[PDB]
Symmetry: C2
Subunit: 219 residues, 2 copies
């Protein structure tokens, strides 16, 4: 016994089941992690409208300006947006977010100084930076949906392939010999050739069979 069927199949079943739970599980993780994407885009997007609302408050001399500045700070630091500071989120997203933070520091100050000229000069570029942040969240959302197809489809192909060759091996090193042992057996049960060369358990069974059978024919 230099190659048991126990180890071979177990081995093959371990690697196949493994990557089936890896590919399948990673895909689910990725879907699950997308549950808060629509919220992040919504909140991230609202920062655009709020930025303009602030300029509108400023231009009108609205008493709401200070409250609205507070709301912007609040929404910019929403749980959903602060959560993006994780390893598995693209650095681009995290980078842009940091940039929105520094921009806001200045914008908030200029607003409090009632500096409308600065605002008029800078608002368009300010809001564009936010808009490119929201665009990056959008792309990141799409990326995840595509990765799930990739992982499922690619892992899938990888599984078919491993299963194709494992099934072919089993057809050849388990089933074929078994059929030979079954024929021989039924023929013996009426009144005395196999694969005794196999390096596995079936090779051995056919060796002993050949022995026990051959001696009977002689007797």
């Amino acid at each position: 016994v230099k190659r048991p069927v126990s180890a071979s199949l177990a081995r093959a079943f371990f690697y196949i089941v493994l990557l089936s739970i890896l590919s399948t599980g990673i895909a689910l993780l990725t879907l699950a992690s997308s549950l808060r994407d629509a919220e992040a885009i919504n909140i991230a997007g609202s920062l655009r409208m709020q930025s303009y609302r602030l300029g509108y408050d400023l231009q009108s001399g609205s008493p709401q300006l200070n409250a609205h500045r507070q709301l912007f700070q609040q929404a910019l630091h929403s749980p959903v947006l602060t959560n993006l500071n994780v390893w598995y989120v693209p650095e681009a997203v995290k980078t842009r977010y940091a940039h929105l933070n520094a921009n806001w520091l200045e914008m908030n100050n200029r607003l409090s100084k009632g500096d409308l000229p600065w605002y008029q000069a800078n608002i368009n570029n300010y809001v564009n930076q936010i808009d490119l942040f929201v665009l990056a969240l959008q792309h990141y959302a799409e990326r995840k949906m595509l990765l799930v197809v990739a992982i499922s489809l690619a892992g899938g192909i990888g599984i078919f392939t491993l299963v194709f060759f494992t099934l072919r091996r089993i057809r050849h090193q388990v089933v074929a010999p078994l059929n030979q042992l079954v024929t021989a057996s039924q023929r013996i049960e009426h009144g005395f050739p196999l694969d005794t060369n196999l390096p596995n358990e079936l090779g051995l069974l056919a060796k002993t069979f050949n022995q026990m059978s051959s001696e009977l024919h002689k007797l």
Copy 2:
């Protein structure tokens, strides 16, 4: 015989393979049905900003007012938002969207007449309506995603349970009895002659029987 060892080994692979087909299938129609949720929400949301920018344009007497009025119409009628008026999309979304169209008509009108007093009195409610439309889309996207997670996780565990049990049946009906046959076969090599389990509905049962007989008669004649 009833369950060829082949069939038992094939079924365990069949369930794993089927998991992958379903897994890609589900991912594909998730993609087909939801790849643009994020664009929809981004654009839907952007209408909120554009409404305030227009106000901002109005108050400044900006020459960009008309160009920006056009952008809103254009953004309001993006393919992604127009392709929402469909059976699969909750009536909530579709209703709120229609509301937005009616509102934009008057709002566009008041902008061109340069009616700032009206803008000031109505903008906050105007933008709240858009905001609720965006919220409708958001919840619609989350429900779909949540549904897909639940179904996938259900189907995954459903199928992996069958694989688990098929894989257990193989350790009992196949691997274990092979180890018996291997031990019995080894003793015979040295003329040793208990009986093997013949209960199995597979080829190992059939072989156990003939193995049992040939060995029992040898011990008597020998």
